[PDB]
Design a protein around this ligand. Structure first.
Ligand SMILES: OC[C@H]1O[C@H](O)[C@@H](O)[C@@H](O)[C@@H]1O
Ligand SMILES: OC[C@H]1O[C@H](O)[C@@H](O)[C@@H](O)[C@@H]1O
Ligand SMILES: OC[C@H]1O[C@H](O)[C@@H](O)[C@@H](O)[C@@H]1O
Ligand SMILES: OC[C@H]1O[C@H](O)[C@@H](O)[C@@H](O)[C@@H]1O
Ligand SMILES: OC[C@H]1O[C@H](O)[C@@H](O)[C@@H](O)[C@@H]1O
Ligand SMILES: OC[C@H]1O[C@H](O)[C@@H](O)[C@@H](O)[C@@H]1O
Lengths: 121, 121
């Protein structure tokens, strides 16, 4: 199953492999750009990129979805916020008091799905 | 606490958020560059960038570590191989038959620690 293992010591400043998120969005999610890699189509407007600082991670996240992704918003453990971007369709699902680890999904001309890997607190 | 949740529908082509890895290495790990972002110092030599192909992922990995990261090697489900890069310090830790989902860690002037998130098959 899903698991996590740490290697090394205690020094240094923390970093996350999930380093930046942007979206293209209109009334729905046309694309998500994860660490600079584009996933989806070219519709909508390109949001400015959210780039995480050291020790910063998504701690709350609302995704509206139906047969596709309609809307994304999140807040980090530092209190910074992204979105909401997208429209009011689908229905909202919220992750509360989490640490998002990775954002995978599926995309074509639009953002069909997201697979969110996170730690639940 | 580590889990995952899927939102949205069935369409599109799958994508993974972890897309490329390079390292700076000498007798140990000086830096890791994940999805294009540099974490760590300026010592050692910069490795070529390993860019994951469509549907490719780390399936087997060895990390040598003590108080820092001493060496990294991995192999993928497409038979590709990365490293070993680094030295002989620390102790070997081996992941067998996995799918690496994400790499977090900690770095200053060197690579202090790695947090590997993976599915264990
Ligand atoms: O988000 C779906 C759709 O929303 C609006 O119609 C416009 O912004 C389009 O460009 C976009 O494709
Ligand atoms: O998610 C795409 C689309 O899927 C379904 O048709 C409904 O939930 C809509 O409200 C939503 O906009
Ligand atoms: O992403 C919207 C849509 O784009 C393309 O038509 C295909 O990839 C579909 O599978 C996908 O559902
Ligand atoms: O990797 C640890 C260390 O190895 C060698 O001594 C050199 O390449 C250094 O620049 C590097 O920092
Ligand atoms: O990890 C850096 C360093 O940490 C400890 O001192 C020992 O495990 C060494 O063998 C190792 O090289
Ligand atoms: O990365 C090696 C070393 O570099 C810097 O001195 C600091 O970030 C330390 O915490 C770290 O252990």
């Amino acid at each position: 199953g899903l698991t996590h293992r740490k290697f090394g010591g205690s020094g240094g400043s923390p970093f996350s492999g999930l380093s930046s998120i942007a979206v293209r969005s209109g009334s729905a999610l046309d694309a998500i750009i994860i660490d600079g890699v584009h996933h989806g189509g070219s519709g909508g407007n390109l949001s400015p990129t959210f780039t995480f600082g050291s020790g910063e991670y998504i701690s709350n996240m609302t995704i509206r979805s139906g047969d596709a992704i309609d809307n994304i918003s999140f807040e980090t453990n530092m209190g910074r916020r992204f979105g909401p971007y997208g429209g009011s369709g689908g229905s909202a699902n919220t992750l509360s008091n989490v640490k998002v680890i990775q954002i995978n999904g599926s995309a074509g001309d639009a953002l069909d799905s997201l697979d969110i890997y996170y730690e639940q607190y």
